[PDB]
Amino acid sequence: MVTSEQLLFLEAWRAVDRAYVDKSFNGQSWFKLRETYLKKEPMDRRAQTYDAIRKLLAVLDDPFTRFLEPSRLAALRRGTAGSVTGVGLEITYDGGSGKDVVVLTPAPGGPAEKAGARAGDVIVTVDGTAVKGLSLYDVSDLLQGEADSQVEVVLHAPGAPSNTRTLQLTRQKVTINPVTFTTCSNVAAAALPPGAAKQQLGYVRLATFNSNTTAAAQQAFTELSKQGVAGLVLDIRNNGGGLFPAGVNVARMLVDRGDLVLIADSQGIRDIYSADGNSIDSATPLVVLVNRGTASASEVLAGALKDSKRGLIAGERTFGKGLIQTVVDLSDGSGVAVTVARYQTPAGVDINKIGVSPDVQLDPEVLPTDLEGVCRVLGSDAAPRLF
């Protein structure tokens, strides 16, 4: 009893049937839905088939698992770093039923940031258009405009739905500097590891994972190692993640041996990344600063450092953003955006759920990120007890 529509619809259910990270399918029977859908859903034109697929998708309750019509799967292939400007915002969906779009993290030194926008903030409206239930690609499309434009954005601090802040922001192309680093001298007793033969700390700010990150980090650890600093301070607060291989890369710069990250699903581990025995410094004491703005590849890195005992985790519990998606192409040029995998720390911890918890519960905001500032605080009498 075959149709062109049914076939397409089945490709879409299959993709999912076969790739979805959770084989309990939001506790639905994926196979029975198939039946139900072929039976009760109108698939007389492709448009209708598209709708049924969409419907089908939503039962899952995974905002990252979405259908892509051929236009977006074009528009989406590569290209938005270009002549397209935004407001230094990095967005994602909320905690439980995350209908909500939140600021993952605001681009450091970005117009949104320099305006009061913080990690955890809920995005209420962009230009008057509510954003709940909306795609990220869609939301980005509202955020995006051109150079010199403006856009008003209304947020609210998490849990404070009334606590509403409106932000009129000026569109600017925002490059995030991957890394910053310095040596801090005359560091205060309280912030120095226990065995410190020298009142120096190497501080490294690692703000994002990108194409430049690896080279910039190699630089920092190299130089700092040379300086013979007493301890290391890796600050990955408010760092959304980004390039995963860059995360491994840095992890392999500090960890000489051991697993770093596990990639798993419903069914068990799919992949594993381990150290290569090539670190830069596997020996200087290291404290890693994190906060709730630490996500994804930055959390992978946190868990690697932690589970390896390479370093202490200081600050506050990270994002809990551990899902990996992908796009499965349909025969007619459309696509299915699906979560196919999840990150786990070497110890078996599920990133997505739990997040990476600190060893040294600290008051995360203690340190600034600007260099001068950072050393001062560290040289202060009130310096934080990092280790």
Side-chain angles (χ1 to χ4, degrees):
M1 299 300 289
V2 162
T3 91
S4 53
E5 299 326 286
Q6 302 191 336
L7 293 167
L8 192 81
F9 183 82
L10 277 181
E11 267 189 61
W13 169 99
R14 245 177 237 113
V16 167
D17 183 60
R18 277 169 175 168
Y20 196 59
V21 51
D22 188 7
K23 292 317 159 64
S24 91
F25 308 105
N26 198 226
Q28 295 293 278
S29 183
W30 203 236
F31 208 84
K32 168 165 192 183
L33 255 58
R34 175 176 160 157
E35 292 187 358
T36 267
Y37 278 56
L38 293 169
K39 282 49 99 162
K40 306 268 85 159
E41 310 284 331
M43 294 183 202
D44 304 306
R45 340 167 183 139
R46 185 58 49 90
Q48 283 171 348
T49 308
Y50 279 177
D51 290 335
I53 286 163
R54 271 184 295 269
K55 229 210 148 129
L56 168 82
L57 295 197
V59 315
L60 274 198
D61 303 341
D62 175 10
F64 286 116
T65 294
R66 322 224 133 212
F67 178 71
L68 308 159
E69 279 192 9
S71 41
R72 248 185 200 19
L73 154 96
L76 143 276
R77 273 289 136 177
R78 26 33 196 154
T80 20
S83 57
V84 234
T85 56
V87 312
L89 254 179
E90 189 189 10
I91 65 175
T92 202
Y93 308 100
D94 206 39
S97 67
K99 252 169 209 243
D100 288 284
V101 182
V102 315
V103 171
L104 220 193
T105 218
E113 176 195 52
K114 337 153 348 239
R118 308 277 178 264
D121 281 353
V122 175
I123 303 204
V124 198
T125 91
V126 205
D127 272 301
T129 307
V131 318
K132 235 241 206 91
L134 256 160
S135 96
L136 286 186
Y137 301 107
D138 276 7
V139 182
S140 312
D141 302 320
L142 291 178
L143 295 191
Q144 312 175 339
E146 54 154 46
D148 280 294
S149 44
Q150 311 165 221
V151 66
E152 114 211 309
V153 166
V154 190
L155 7 154
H156 107 245
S162 288
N163 202 62
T164 79
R165 264 306 112 193
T166 327
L167 304 192
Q168 8 191 264
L169 335 181
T170 296
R171 280 182 192 98
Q172 318 166 26
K173 260 162 172 125
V174 190
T175 257
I176 290 170
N177 175 44
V179 172
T180 248
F181 85 77
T182 183
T183 309
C184 289
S185 231
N186 294 119
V187 168
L192 276 185
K198 228 158 124 157
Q199 349 147 267
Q200 256 153 66
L201 280 192
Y203 169 76
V204 184
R205 179 52 187 129
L206 194 198
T208 197
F209 302 87
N210 73 201
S211 20
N212 286 308
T213 292
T214 293
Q218 158 156 214
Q219 187 182 74
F221 293 124
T222 288
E223 281 306 330
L224 305 167
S225 168
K226 280 201 180 164
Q227 267 285 130
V229 293
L232 286 158
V233 194
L234 181 60
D235 177 5
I236 59 192
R237 307 174 276 166
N238 281 65
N239 184 347
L243 228 127
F244 168 90
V248 182
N249 287 350
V250 184
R252 302 192 165 114
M253 276 184 215
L254 287 176
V255 190
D256 232 330
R257 227 185 147 151
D259 294 337
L260 308 172
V261 229
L262 336 150
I263 338 249
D265 56 42
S266 254
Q267 138 272 108
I269 286 158
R270 296 239 351 138
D271 204 344
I272 306 187
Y273 296 89
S274 304
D276 37 25
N278 71 169
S279 50
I280 295 176
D281 185 354
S282 52
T284 318
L286 158 69
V287 60
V288 177
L289 13 189
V290 312
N291 73 333
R292 60 192 76 199
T294 306
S296 190
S298 331
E299 286 181 280
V300 155
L301 175 62
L305 289 170
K306 177 183 184 165
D307 304 356
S308 54
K309 279 269 57 189
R310 173 70 192 84
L312 279 163
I313 311 310
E316 87 195 342
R317 185 95 127 246
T318 68
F319 196 92
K321 166 184 185 84
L323 313 174
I324 296 161
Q325 292 63 57
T326 193
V327 165
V328 201
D329 309 316
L330 298 187
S331 73
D332 65 336
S334 41
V336 166
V338 207
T339 299
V340 296
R342 67 205 305 138
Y343 294 120
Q344 320 208 303
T345 72
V349 170
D350 197 84
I351 281 166
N352 202 256
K353 312 212 130 230
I354 301 142
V356 187
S357 68
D359 295 325
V360 198
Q361 255 290 161
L362 273 176
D363 176 279
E365 308 288 276
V366 71
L367 293 187
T369 56
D370 68 270
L371 302 171
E372 187 175 298
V374 172
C375 294
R376 186 224 163 77
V377 156
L378 295 166
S380 57
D381 47 10
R385 310 228 265 185
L386 286 182
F387 298 80

